[PDB]
Amino acid sequence: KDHRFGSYAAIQENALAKWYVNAKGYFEDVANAMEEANEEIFITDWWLSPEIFLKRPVVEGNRWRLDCILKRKAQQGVRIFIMLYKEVELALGINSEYTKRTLMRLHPNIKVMRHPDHVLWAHHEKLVIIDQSVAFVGGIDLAYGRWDDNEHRLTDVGSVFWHGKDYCNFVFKDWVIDRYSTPRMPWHDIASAVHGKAARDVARHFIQRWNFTKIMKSKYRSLSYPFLLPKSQTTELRYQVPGSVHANVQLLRSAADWSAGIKYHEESIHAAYVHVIENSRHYIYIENQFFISCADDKVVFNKIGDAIAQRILKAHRENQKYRVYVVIPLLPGFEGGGNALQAIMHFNYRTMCRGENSILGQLKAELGNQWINYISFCGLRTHAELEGNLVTELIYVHSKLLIADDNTVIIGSANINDRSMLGKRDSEMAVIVQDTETVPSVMDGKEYQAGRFARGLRLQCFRVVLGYLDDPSEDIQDPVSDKFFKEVWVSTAARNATIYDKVFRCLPNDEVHNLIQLRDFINKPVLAKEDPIRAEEELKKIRGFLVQFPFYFLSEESLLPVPMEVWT
Numbered sequence: 027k028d029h030r031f032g033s034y035a036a037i038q039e040n041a042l043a044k045w046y047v048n049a050k051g052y053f054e055d056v057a058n059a060m061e062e063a064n065e066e067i068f069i070t071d072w073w074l075s076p077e078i079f080l081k082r083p084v085v086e087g088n089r090w091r092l093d094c095i096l097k098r099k100a101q102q103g104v105r106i107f108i109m110l111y112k113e114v115e116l117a118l119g120i121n122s123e124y125t126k127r128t129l130m131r132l133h134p135n136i137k138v139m140r141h142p143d144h145v146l147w148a149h150h151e152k153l154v155i156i157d158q159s160v161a162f163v164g165g166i167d168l169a170y171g172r173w174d175d176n177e178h179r180l181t182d183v184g185s186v187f188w189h190g191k192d193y194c195n196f197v198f199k200d201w202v203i204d205r206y207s208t209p210r211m212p213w214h215d216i217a218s219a220v221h222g223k224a225a226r227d228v229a230r231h232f233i234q235r236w237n238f239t240k241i242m243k244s245k246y247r248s249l250s251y252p253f254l255l256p257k258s259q260t261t262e263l264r265y266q267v268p269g270s271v272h273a274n275v276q277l278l279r280s281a282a283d284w285s286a287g288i289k290y291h292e293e294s295i296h297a298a299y300v301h302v303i304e305n306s307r308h309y310i311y312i313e314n315q316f317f318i319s320c321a322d323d324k325v326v327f328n329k330i331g332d333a334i335a336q337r338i339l340k341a342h343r344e345n346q347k348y349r350v351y352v353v354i355p356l357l358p359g360f361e362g363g364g365n366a367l368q369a370i371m372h373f374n375y376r377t378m379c380r381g382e383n384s385i386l387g388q389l390k391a392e393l394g395n396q397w398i399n400y401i402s403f404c405g406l407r408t409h410a411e412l413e414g415n416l417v418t419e420l421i422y423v424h425s426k427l428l429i430a431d432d433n434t435v436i437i438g439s440a441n442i443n444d445r446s447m448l449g450k451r452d453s454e455m456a457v458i459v460q461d462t463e464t465v466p467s468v469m470d471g472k473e474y475q476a477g478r479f480a481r482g483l484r485l486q487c488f489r490v491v492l493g494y495l496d497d498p499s500e501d502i503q504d505p506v507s508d509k510f511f512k513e514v515w516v517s518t519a520a521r522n523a524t525i526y527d528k529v530f531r532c533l534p535n536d537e538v539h540n541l542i543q544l545r546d547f548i549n550k551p552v553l554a555k556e557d558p559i560r561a562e563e564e565l566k567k568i569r570g571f572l573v574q575f576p577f578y579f580l581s582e583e584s585l586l587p588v589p590m591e592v593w594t
């Protein structure tokens with residue numbers, strides 16, 4: 027049938043849905059949903075690490091370690107199906123071959139596929155579906171480094187939260203791991219759960235890929251790899267994710283012949299994103315790992331960055347208040363080294379501010395200097411003391427999140443880049459949630475009926491990044507007023523950025539325009555070391571994690587050197 031946005035799935039009205047800010051709650055609920063499975067567990071991952079703990083701090087021994095959960099459910103008769111991305115032979119990587127063997131050795135009811143063969147793009151969706159009745163969709167893999175809570179801690183010297191290989195730091199530091207010298211990289215991300223017919227929609231995507239891959243590879247043609255069947259739409263599971271509310275939901279994906287055997291590619295995530303931006307009335311809030319857009323229909327093609335610029339110019343033309351918040355990582359992570367990092371920085375900046383085609387280029391040409399009233403670009407950072415020394419690290423924004431108007435959300439695996447959005451490249455999954463239940467709220471000082479689901483999630487985002495967890499939240503209730511935008515959002519991002527720059531002289535920043543200035547810069551003395559008493563006094567004025575994004579880091583470098591589309 028013909029569905030909205032050309033999705034493979036219909037709008038499911040009054041579906042029960044949940045959101046997650048960071049992995050702590052997500053992994054706990056996944057663990058409890060799996061514990062209650064009776065028939066089927068389906069898992070997809072870009073990377074899966076079998077020994078991660080889903081509940082922490084650890085008690086009850088290995089009861090909540092991922093491999094032990096799967097094994098005891100398989101032992102009860104639950105059939106477990108796992109699809110892993112097959113990384114290049116030359117990748118240091120994801121170790122999918124080892125992980126497959128580990129998993130299938132736990133019990134015969136556990137069946138694992140890897141795809142694609144290389145003798146290309148990737149499978150990027152991160153899904154857990156239980157009994158085709160509860161499904162989790164997000165940006166969070168069941169993998170090392172992902173677990174985090176809203177404190178985004180840099181340290182763990184008792185090994186209370188990140189045992190062994192789970193203590194990771196994927197930030198580039200070779201411009202030219204041991205937990206006693208080096209802080210971890212915190213993992214900031216977003217996920218969701220859906221129930222009922224919506225969950226059956228997630229299952230259908232997983233079944234389509236499973237059966238497609240089964241018939242395409244010799245090794246999976248045997249009876250031992252079951253042919254999967256969708257649960258009849260006529261028919262649930264004795265688990266409801268606590269905290270869920272009813273809303274209109276719709277599954278969306280990126281998929282194509284190579285990834286799912288469909289003849290015409292699907293790019294319904296992309297379509298949904300452009301639609302939500304175009305129809306927003308008050309604000310959009312983006313947290314995303316990448317920010318590669320602004321189409322020249324030669325090297326970049328997706329329409330999101332141009333939709334943003336054009337929505338702002340409409341607000342200006344109608345003399346309307348409209349805000350765009352953009353939170354991305356301060357540096358790209360690597361999980362080619364430095365030339366890979368630089369290529370992604372090229373395209374992120376190309377979308378933001380480098381070129382007349384940039385978002386800022388387009389706004390300037392029509393708005394000149396008034397662009398500051400409409401958009402703010404940020405990353406995340408934090409600090410701590412490690413073994414008597416002040417340290418800082420960026421917080422990796424791994425999210426793939428769009429919120430509009432406190433009433434519409436898109437959560438999934440798709441990054442703002444062509445790889446995720448065009449549909450023909452990496453395979454991806456997202457869900458759009460549109461509120462049907464509203465609460466009395468405020469929007470530019472005016473009475474406003476906000477959506478239960480989207481407002482709750484936007485407020486939790488705000489609390490995390492602005493520093494209002496467990497605090498009176500009056501200052502953050504209105505997401506578009508001059509008072510909030512200037513005195514809370516833009517002020518926090520500038521204040522924290524200034525403090526971190528002064529205390530740590532950390533990269534990235536607006537002073538370092540070329541790689542040779544970088545080397546000299548980092549050899550200069552650092553206050554955090556020279557006068558820690560004073561540094562610690564200055565850091566007491568930090569509130570939240572938000573920091574203003576530096577437009578001019580490696581300004582003068584041509585950040586390009588492998589085809590371009592690998593980076594875009």
Ligand SMILES: *[PH-](=O)([O-])[O-]
Pocket residue numbers: 072150315439441
């Ligand atoms: P994904 O795990 O690369 O965004």
